[PDB]
Amino acid sequence: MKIIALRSSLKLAARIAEELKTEPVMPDERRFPDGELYLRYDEDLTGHNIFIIGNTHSDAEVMEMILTLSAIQDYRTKSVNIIAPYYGYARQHQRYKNGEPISSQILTEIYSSYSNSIATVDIHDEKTLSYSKVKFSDLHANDAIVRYYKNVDVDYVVSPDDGGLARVADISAKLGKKHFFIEKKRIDDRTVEMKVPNVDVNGKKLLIVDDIISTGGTIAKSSGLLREKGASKIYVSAVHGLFVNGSENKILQNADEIHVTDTVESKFSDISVYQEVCNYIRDI
C-alpha cells in the first residue's frame, strides 16, 4: 500500500502511515508564477493500493485533490482510494432555495469518477454519501473521543442541538454516562432553550459534543446557557475544528476546554482519529 499525504492532512496522514509502517508520500508542490497549482509524485506507485489522504473544503484543497487524482494516473496502480478526513460542502446537502448548486453532489461525482472508493470521518449529512457511484464510507471519531474522556470527570454528555443525538448517545453509552440535548429556537427576537430531558446541570460537569465547529456560535450559546444554570465544568469537543475568527474566544467565554480531532489540524487537535482510519484501510 501507498499512503499519499496531502498538505491539509500531513499530521493525521503521518500518524496513519507510522501505524501502518509505511511512507507518508508527500507531493512536491508549488504554485506557478500565474497562481496555477503544480504537483509531482516521483515515487513509483505502480501496482500498489493507493490511499490519498486530504481534506476537500478549501478551493486549494479541492485543486490538490483533483490534480493528485490526475498525477497518479501516470502509474498503473492497483486501486485508488480517497480518504478525506473532513469532507467539504456536506453542508446539507440539497437545494434551498432554487438555483443553488448541490455542491456535494457534483464534487462527490467528480471524486468518485477517479477513484475506487471514498471515505470521510463524520460527514455532516449522510445524504451526500448517496451521490457517489463507488462505495462512500462514513467513519466515526466516537471511539477516539471516548478514549480521551475515559480519564476525565464527566457527569453528562450533551448535544448543542437536536441533531447530533446519535453520536452523543453512543459516546455517552461508551463512557457509561447519562446524556441530554439542548433545543434552541428563536421566537420573535427572543431566544428559547429546552433541555431534553430537563436535566439539572447545577454543579455538574458537562461534555458538549458536535460534529463541526465553524463560527463557534452554536456551541458558545449552549455553553453560556449551561454555565448560567450552574454547570461546574464544560468541556467542548467536535470532530472538525475549523475555528473561523474568532470562534475559539467565543467558546472559551464559558467553556473550560476545547478538544477536537486531527481531521482538521489546529492547536486544539488533542484527539487523533488515526486508529479509526487505519481500521478502514486495513479492512479495505
- Indicate the residue among 14 and 252 with the shorter CB distance to a copy of itself: 14
Site for ligand ADP in 42-101 (CB under 6 A): 42, 91-92, 96
| C-alpha to C-alpha distance for 182 and 150, rounded to whole angstroms | 23
- Indicate the residue among 31 and 150 with the shorter CB distance to a copy of itself: 31
Q: How far is CA 41 from CA 45, 46, 47, 73, 263, in A?
A: 9, 12, 15, 11, 23
Could you tell which of a copy of itself, ligand ADP, none binds residue 28, using a CB distance below 5 to 8 A set by kind? Answer: a copy of itself
| C-alpha to C-alpha distance for 262 and 269, rounded to whole angstroms | 5
Contact 144, 275 (CB under 8 A): yes
Task: Find the part of the chain contacting a copy of itself (CB under 8 A) among 108-116, 140-148, 231-239, 249-257.
Answer: 108-116
Q: Is 280 helix (H, G, I), strand (E, B) or coil?
A: helix
Contact 251, 258 (CB under 8 A): yes
Catalytic choice (127, 178, 184, 195): 184
- Indicate the residue among 82 and 146 with the shorter CB distance to a copy of itself: 82
Could you tell which of a copy of itself, ligand ADP, none binds residue 125, using a CB distance below 5 to 8 A set by kind? Answer: ligand ADP
Site for a copy of itself in 64-103 (CB under 8 A): 66-75, 88-89, 91-92, 95-103
Residue 56, annotated as binding a ligand: no
- Indicate the residue among 149 and 243 with the shorter CB distance to a copy of itself: 243
| C-alpha to C-alpha distance for 159 and 165, rounded to whole angstroms | 6
Could you tell which of a copy of itself, ligand ADP, none binds residue 138, using a CB distance below 5 to 8 A set by kind? Answer: none
What is the contact mask toward a copy of itself in residues 217 to 236, using x (rule: CB under 8 A)?
A: --------------------
* Contact residue for ligand ADP among 28, 36, 59, 188 (CB under 6 A): 36
- The least CB distance from residue 95 to ligand ADP, in Å, is 9
Give φ, ψ of 271 to 5 degrees. -120, 120
- Confirm whether 233 is a catalytic residue: no
Nine-digit cell at 111?
A: 471524486
Nine-digit cell at 191?
A: 431566544
**249 is a contact residue toward a copy of itself (CB under 8 A):** no
* Contact residue for a copy of itself among 77, 215, 266, 275 (CB under 8 A): 215
Indicate which residues carry an active-site annotation.
Answer: 184
Query: Which amino acids are annotated as binding site for ATP, given as ranges?
Result: 34-36, 91-93
